[PDB]
Amino acid sequence: GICPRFAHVIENLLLGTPSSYETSLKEFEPDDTMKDAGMQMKKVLDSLPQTTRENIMKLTEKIVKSPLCM
């Protein structure tokens, strides 16, 4: 379906704090550039309403649990 650590990453991206996202990322030993790019992503996603991020999470689960991703 989906790499468990990756899912954690996405969960923290959409619904968690920059803090927890940050910890999540460090597992993968990103370089400073990739880490910076990822925080730029977080900052902008955080502009979206809560409801919107919940629906993106729900959307993400529907993709990863599709017959198409089996």
Place this chain on the structure above:
Amino acid sequence: GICPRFAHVIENLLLGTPSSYETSLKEFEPDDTMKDAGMQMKKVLDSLPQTTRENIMKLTEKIVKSPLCM
């Protein structure tokens, strides 16, 4: 590593047009709400510089190809 269709989705999200992202999504038969949420995501990611999106893509590949996602 990663569901091939999902990866396509992400690729189109970060580096493609709203158009191609849109086609990509439809595979998964998203409802109108999930589709709307996903387009709201696209619109905001599109605010980020090209370079930034390239690095997020590179970051994404590093995650999916980690020993941790084996």
